[PDB]
Symmetry: C5
Subunit: 311 residues, 5 copies
């Protein structure tokens, strides 16, 4: 089978539509997501025209192998989609209505700068390559673009699923390509981060600050070094769920800042002890008393500055 012949010199228009049934497995580290959807296609093939009076039926059903079907592929997939043709229906004028249900692992890059208070635009790029006989162009049938109400992406809020109606038509290896951008806007459910990571980090940080009400070096060393070990466990825990970015993320900046605070508290603890040994407890007492206010105040201001830069 060859493609439909043109009436004039016009390109063949393939109307497309994606209807999302399921969204699952948004892997942050891998920058992938899995999708289960309907792919709807429509184009005119005059060669397929029929008289319903003679044929006995008002719509004709076909098997994919029986007729010409445009080779539509996804740009940003790991492997080619797993597809099952649901229906192929030809109307008397030769208007073909193709419908398949597919599943695919989509590659879509993420912006982690504001993580975990971040939002993403996931893309599904539909493409068609023009044949040597006639040029093929993609179009969006908005009445056939949507998502199921139930569609839940664990840990995310689905804002919208829309398509950029104008295809990107460009040459690639001496032939025309027609590319459509289907965009799924999502925002992270930051809730869990607060009681599970943020608040535990603060509690252990405040525990380390009790060293500012102690003159016992051995106890102070235990407090600061032990809380530092607990903090490292949280840093590893957090970083394992993120990919290695060539930029600073909000979480990353906070983690880095906390290390500085632990480092400076060791300096304070060390300085205070050195003075007490040098028989200067009056000078050490001045530093500690200052540390009691300075550490929370600088912690609060540094965080305001960070939140300002990132948001």
């Amino acid at each position: 089978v060859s493609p439909p012949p043109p009436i004039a010199d016009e390109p063949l228009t393939v109307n497309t539509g994606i209807y999302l049934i399921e969204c699952y497995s948004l892997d942050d580290k891998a920058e992938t997501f899995k999708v289960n959807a309907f792919l709807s296609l429509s184009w005119k093939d005059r060669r397929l025209a029929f008289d319903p009076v003679r044929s006995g039926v008002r719509v004709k059903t076909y098997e994919p192998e029986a007729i010409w079907i445009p080779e539509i592929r996804f740009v940003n997939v790991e492997n080619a989609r797993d597809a099952d043709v649901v229906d192929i229906s030809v109307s008397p004028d030769g208007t073909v209505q193709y419908l398949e249900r597919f599943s695919a692992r989509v590659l879509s890059p993420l912006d982690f700068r504001r993580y975990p208070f971040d939002s993403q635009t996931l893309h599904i790029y539909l493409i068609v390559r023009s044949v040597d006989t006639r040029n093929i162009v993609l179009a969006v049938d908005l009445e056939k673009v949507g998502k199921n109400d139930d569609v839940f992406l664990t840990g995310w809020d689905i804002e919208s699923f829309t398509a950029v109606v104008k295809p990107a038509n460009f040459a690639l290896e001496d032939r025309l390509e027609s590319k459509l951008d289907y965009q799924l806007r999502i925002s992270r459910q930051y809730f869990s981060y607060i009681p599970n990571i943020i608040l535990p980090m603060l509690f252990i940080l405040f525990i380390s600050w009790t060293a500012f009400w102690s003159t016992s070096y051995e106890a102070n060393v235990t407090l600061v070094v032990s809380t530092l070990i607990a903090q490292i466990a949280f840093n590893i825990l957090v970083e394992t769920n993120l990919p290695k970015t060539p930029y600073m993320t909000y979480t990353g900046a906070i983690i880095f800042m906390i290390y500085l605070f632990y480092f400076v508290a060791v300096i304070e603890v060390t300085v205070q002890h050195y003075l007490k040994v040098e028989s200067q407890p009056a000078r050490a007492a001045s530093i500690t008393r200052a540390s009691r206010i300075a550490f929370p105040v600088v912690f609060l201001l540094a965080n305001i500055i960070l939140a300002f830069l990132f948001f």
Copy 2:
């Protein structure tokens, strides 16, 4: 092959049934489970009718390709099910009895609010899309819905496997869809959580409380900070088996509460030491003596309040 033609303008009823052979791999983090079952379908095709006295046979066997079979799919599957047709049998009136065995990975959301004392209703949604010729509707043959006695879901108790007999009939992309809800009611086997997680957590908490019978700051700091590190290990261990929820879970609340108790015990330990250094051991002794009763009493009351709110 085309669908059976109607006698009048009635829709074509497909009687369904799912008989569970196996249930395995209930992944809490992924909110998925695997199933191995029988799918039974039944509908009337008058074109397939015959006379038993003339044919000599009471039942006719067919190959799937030989006759029309309705395209039945699962809504909440990762990939389309792996299926093997077991038998196709036609009765003299043209009643078709189809049976396949399939395996599938089902996406079903879980409510972790009461975890590990939660119960769940897992769903298997059966769907059929109507054809241009006639509308297809789903039905439940209760005599063909069930599960094998051996069916064991590791760490769960299977309460019941039933179907909501009334299908959800709705339009989707200008065609009728008929959806059936199969519900598998399960309850978590909480036994293991008690000796493996709950009791260890209490033991380490009680060890931290021995600091209320000590005047040794260095020792107290060691007790509270070391037990805190052991608690963190349990918290990480527990939370790794759960997904990130946009709500508080029972376990989450408990873990948060324990952090507060560790934080308050550091305050007590710090306050007591500050007073002893300020040459006020009488005041410190009053606080410690109070702490010995206050901490267990507030721990017990806070837990009663929590259990009340969640159950």
Copy 3:
């Protein structure tokens, strides 16, 4: 093709045999194992009979598609087996001899009560379904049941591979089903558990007991709390290799018992220190001297009691 017709009203006997080539991946947490074996089938089809004299051949070879073959399935598989037909041979009387080589992931539940000094009976359930035309029944050809001498299941000893010769005949979805039970008896290689888990746990427990020869609270607190952290690491290590059971396991009981012993040693350490501070070292010295004998004696007796209850 239809099934062989009966001479009288007798059922169709399918003689079966499984010959194990490989056993691998016994996943305890998943309660699964992989198997690579030969499945041998044999039945009489009178339609396939011939005279060896006029044919010139003593045997005829066929392609699966050419003749009727019984649809034999495994009950307890994840997905349907991956099979390759090795040979199909017909004798003059029409006795068919079928042979395939298959690989499959088998679901078989395990009893962890005596872990890691446990033994298991793994099952492979063979099943055939009857047809309207006739009743199909399974049988065991003992001369065709076995295993390769090389068959090694990593961490297990293979005791025996036998079949329960009488099939279980029952109705399922208004048709008779013939089920055969192939049982593989295995016993765990407990060797490694002794130097890698059991002995390390004892060594760290004995290190905690050196606190009974010390009056130094700070040192005692360090000993008991640090060894407790090492034990927790071993507990996590062990429990990660086991599924969550609704019953107590031997290992679980031991782990629980060790927690009690650590808890009681903290009480002793705390009590002893409280008395020394209260200017009662004579009373503390009596308790500590008693603890030196009491702890090992109660540890040994509790273990004898546990081993008695489980074995």
Copy 4:
């Protein structure tokens, strides 16, 4: 179908091209990467020649099965590529233009000597085996070698994608084999390693150095041994993302050097305490004061020496 017959005794030239659509999953431990690309092939088949005047067409389209296509494979793949033929086009002189889209998991060894500041040359080896009738040889059509602008390999910078235009011809089992080398030059995005691993390691090392301003053996032991435990966590964290190399890596050298520094600081801490006990604090004070300068100076010089040897 047989291969095109030679005009004289010349080998058959197959012009190749690879156009990268996607690059993902560069696994360092596994030394693999996944690729989604276009494979373009071109060769002359005189048997397929035609007159454009008589036929009325300027280009003929064929199905893969209809004509002879060279068996082109990849040398360094896990499994054979997943390929879908996009188009086959013949020009009047019989010049065939084949295009497929494939996905493949490529095995390419990496040099970890300068990690995490390393660069790699990933290879895709294309191969063809000569047939009994004629010798096949590969060529590069540079106009058909490229990559999509969007092509992003998470954590890497893509420098260039080129092909070594002269094939590596050789005999394998008495047949000519023409092999092409497609090279993808990449360089690691080392940014994240600085705040996430390098700077934390320095901070904990500097914390251990505060022991040079303390006379308290107990506190010194705590400082050095606790920071050592934090460093081992980072060492394990780092080494888990790398395979076991038969050579020293930059990172591994640094990790080893840090262990020596921790070891030497324990010697200092031990020596200082031994002298204070031997009533020689003046001698100990000399060593500590020296250590305060010696440790940072030797640390800085050793690092310059290391960076010099590796870069």
Copy 5:
């Protein structure tokens, strides 16, 4: 198609050869490895003979379906191999030359007794089952056995790839089977184990030994118990890469021995402190001074004894 008929009563000889293209994923815990190779087969089929003068051709090419091909399988594979026929060529006398490229996951047991200074012999077992018409026997064409120069197994040195030329001919389920053993000799690149595991273990052990130059029980307890925790981290790290063996490994013996040394050092530390409290520092001083020599000497001798027993 049926097998070639014999001239007399001789068995049909199938000459085999395996040429390794790639070796990857040697999983120690799973005792598996992946292979990508050429499988070459050769046998005589007199029915396929022709005259090279009359036919004008020296060689005839065939499609697998066109002629009889022996069913050759691998014994020790997970699933049946993924194969692609490269070429089938017949010479005038009817000598068939078959070549396929395959990929497979091979199950081959490993001896961990000398780990990580161990060597292995990996096996690939080729098998053929005799047909009822005649017996099939395997042979090795040494000119077609080999490996690619590039073949790299990460962390291993490939010593040799040879075949045991005499097949093992035996009866299995009332038919003859011919089995060939292809052996791949490999040795572990033990380099990395020295700086990454062995030397860190020694450094932390030597740190624990500084307790023999200290009279401070609290500090000693901290040194020995903290270094013990670091050792446990390395033990877990090591043993996670190994399967559970029914024998002692070199590594396992060393790890066990180190536990004893830590246990004995706790006894020393405890004894020394007990004496100092009992006002016997002179006796304690004698024990530590002895320990300073005894511990390194016994450590060195025990290791020589161990290395002797294992190598």
